[PDB]
Write a protein that binds this DNA or RNA. Sequence first.
RNA 1: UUUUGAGACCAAGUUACCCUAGGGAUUCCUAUUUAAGAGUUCAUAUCGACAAUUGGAUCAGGACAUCCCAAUGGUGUAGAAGCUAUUAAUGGUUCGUUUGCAACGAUUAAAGUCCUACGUGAUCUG
RNA 2: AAUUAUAUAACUUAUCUAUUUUAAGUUUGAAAUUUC
Lengths: 293, 295, 454
Amino acid sequence: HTWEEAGLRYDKAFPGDRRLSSVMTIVKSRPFREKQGKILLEGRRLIADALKAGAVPKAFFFSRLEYVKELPVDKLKDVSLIKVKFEDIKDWSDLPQGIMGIFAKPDPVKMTYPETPLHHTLPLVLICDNLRDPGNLGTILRSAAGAGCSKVLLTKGCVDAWEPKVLRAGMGAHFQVPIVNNVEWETVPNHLPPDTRVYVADNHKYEEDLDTKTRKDWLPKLEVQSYDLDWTGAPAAVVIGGETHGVSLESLQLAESTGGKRLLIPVVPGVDSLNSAMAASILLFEGKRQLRI
Amino acid sequence: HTWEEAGLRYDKAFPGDRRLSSVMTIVKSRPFREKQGKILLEGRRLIADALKAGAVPKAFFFSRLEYVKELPVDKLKDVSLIKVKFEDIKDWSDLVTPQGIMGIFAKPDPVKMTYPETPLHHTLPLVLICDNLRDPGNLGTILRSAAGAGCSKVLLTKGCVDAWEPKVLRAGMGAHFQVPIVNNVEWETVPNHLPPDTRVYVADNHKYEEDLDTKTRKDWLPKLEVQSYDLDWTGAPAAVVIGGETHGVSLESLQLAESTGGKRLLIPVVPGVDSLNSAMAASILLFEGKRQLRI
Amino acid sequence: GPLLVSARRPELNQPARLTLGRWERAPLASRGWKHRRSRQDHFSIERVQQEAPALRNLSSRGSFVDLGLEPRVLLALQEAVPEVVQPTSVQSKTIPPLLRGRHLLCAAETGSGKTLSYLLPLFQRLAPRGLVLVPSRELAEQVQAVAQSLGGYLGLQVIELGGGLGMSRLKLQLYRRPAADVLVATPGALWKALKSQLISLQHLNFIVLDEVDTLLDESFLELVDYILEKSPIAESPAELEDPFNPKAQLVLVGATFPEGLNQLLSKVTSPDSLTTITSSKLHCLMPHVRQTFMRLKGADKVTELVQILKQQDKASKTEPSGTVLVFCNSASTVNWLGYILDDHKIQHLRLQGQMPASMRAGIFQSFQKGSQNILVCTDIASRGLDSVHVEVVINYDFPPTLQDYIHRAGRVGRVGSEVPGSVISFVTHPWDVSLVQKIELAARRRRSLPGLAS
RNA sequence: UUUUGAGACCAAGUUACCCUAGGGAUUCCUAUUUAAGAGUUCAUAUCGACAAUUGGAUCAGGACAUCCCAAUGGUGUAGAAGCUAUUAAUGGUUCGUUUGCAACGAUUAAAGUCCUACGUGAUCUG
RNA sequence: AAUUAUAUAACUUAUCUAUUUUAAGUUUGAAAUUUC
């Protein structure tokens, strides 16, 4: 039953509707998300977060009409409002309390982040090195979101930030921090602001990025800088050892060449490389303290 | 008949035992855990950390002997070692495929718990209080987060997740036993749990605060000055309070900080989103003290 | 009457009583399948038989005793394989001549009892005592396991030899196991053993060739010739029973036979000394199996494929359902599709010919063990694969040839099948319209597919 | 070009500007089409109505792989409690929250694990 | 739609002009090819 009432339109799932089928292909497969430029949001709160952030949506699938009435329909311009089976929601979502929201793949550089972090937004970049855990990625973005990092870079092999599970892990952190994905190491220096010193927390699988002949003799003897020392005096960049690969070779070379050092957090045994959530969180904040002081 | 192999003695269990059926319901049915007050530990390195960390063993069921070598043979001397059919192990746990071994544990005593000195080297004079926690994975991630950090002490108040609930412990992957934790602390005794007059800093900007306007949140309860998280708060012994997943801190927490001379910690977030995943909420604030104290 | 052909467009639906004939060009549902604009136009061939054709008419076929099988063998057969209460048509015709030592050529479909057709005379008739040549390693595992199970009851040793295995690893397996009276080997590995002289065929008394058409593939044709020069072959049954001059009995089993095989057999034995038996259903369409044809693009195939999976998921949610076999022509599509399946959080297996031999063996056994209900496999799995419990065969990539389809088709509707088999094939664009046209035309005419002559 | 090295290329709409191929139909009776119910059984021997020409709510049934209830052996069971085992599906197995894979809250003798085309609801009009 | 799209048109460099220290890129598309 599709209803047109008092200027409010909301559709119902149709028999044989191909629209629903495309959702799971878009939702579950990131390459299709890039091919189509779409993403999925889970939960009213995260859905409401996108509406407040002014993210451009694509479609909303909801079990209950009450959610549409609960939601501001005025902000639902770009979404086809469709009533769907609760079985369809589970069929089309591996996780949604009667609401599903498909959104256009946002461009974080174009995303609307208002003043409050911008007052504390610095030319600081958080870099996750081969972060292969979707749960860490989304929750990691909180630290850059809360700290106010100008832009975030993910090295090759990192999980897709726009994946709904990562969106679930961050619970809206993607709408709070600018993110750049699949950043190539060759382009990282361009991604760094001018005069940026790269400081790397050092914890290894980066030895697998080395020629076998020179594999064992290519370990950089980079100076160990305690992370509690002042590093924010000039533009700076933060590198995070991934839970899987840790700090890559390129990060170690870049830090020495960029005039920086190792933002070494002594990694506690039992966690071979400090959890990217923990490594990311520590470095970003007190940089705000050092600059504020 | 007990089988002797590689110096490890393990019995062969009998399927269909009614004891397994009782535990089957305990682990799978969360409400049943409260009625029986029993807990489960899953995984060889999780069990190994637990026993090294003072956890009280009752019995260990393992599918293969290879895991037993990874188990803490030092702490298996007085514990029943029975090689069971994996089907019995599979039924008990919420996870279909455990790491071949599971164990039943009594409530460990935090004082007797032994935590690796490695967190202690990076540990701070910092105490943590959790309020109305509702997610186990964040708790295990928080303690796995805390294991990476080195939190000195953690107090879990009433209404929080059962920290010894089986799935809670699994997420920690041994981190529950790498950092001190105190369970079901009554808010009346929370000031006693901390060293009296220790500056307690409450994380405040929460889900309950989203519904409540900031103005109508200081009239009936002590008023705490709001300071940015980056302002140094660890100059003296510091205590931190972190709100539970999508719940926030309670009334007693705000009363506690002002009595101890503490202040509220403010996290400036992008307007349009109030609080992100609480799992790192403790982590992001907890580390803020970490680097400050080193300076 | 019940629809013999059912299509999305009803006007062309056919009743249970109509035959058009060779001269008349049937108006098939795939006759006009050209322009993508008419999406989703499908047609399914319904199951016309409720009884398994192999099991049907078992009472009308003579007993095993009439086949010359000894009562003592029957007692062992009852204990070893009680399931085969009555012999099929192929078994009834094939067993008696084999016990008499006459060379036999058997043409029959998969699951018709061909394996048991020669195994029963093989054991009664009996430095290996018997030789089994199989084109694929997977078939070797099945035959060796089946032969070993029968051997264990009879106190006989059976081993498996897979092609592509290292010579030093090949020797390791031989030395770690006791001498086997009967050996199941692939042409590639068997040729390696013969070149190294690890085995002698002078004492070989029985040679078995399964999937002769596949065994005759150019990949193995040269290897077979090398075996022949080292293999003494019996010329008449009298020599087979002569203890002074023992020779090897030759038995041929296959689904199709390329032209010219007679010349190869003529030089080894007289053409009139070859006993040829043809199954009544050989090269015939299977009525008891449902065949589904859906109009899908590569992008739309994923949509329908998941929809079919949802139907299977719904079917499992309602009542227990059999395993689903997914056939893909290329490994790259398997990996490309597998990631999509992994993206969907769907438990599935990935199988293709170039996977590690050790890894493939474990996965094949795991699928037999029922570890995962969804298996994606290439053409390597279309031969020598157990599919008793397989409910749906999904040809995600349309089979290139009819013979491959028959091998895929034989997987469903086997003896002892717990579930009613179904076949699903996808045509991305009008690439194999002629293939679909031939299948539909044969069904309407109830005739064998053209070009299937053995 | 011999050898040596550890038979729609791929690729969306739209046509009432169209073209071709066809398929259909063009109050109580009467003629076609359909067939619930009548006919002991059985639609069309004989007749013959109606026509065509969402999350939920309500109520649960069943499986035993036994959570509560129930019947028992043994005990590192004096009794009672427990612990350890057998037998048994007998009836039960709450109400909500879930910032949507998980969990909390409050109770209960217990809030077993599941299955039963969402287990199961039969507007009105075009 | 996909794929291109030195028709043109713009910008940049030439170009041609002033001074003075159309072509090649790119972009649009006149269009082209194939599919729907």
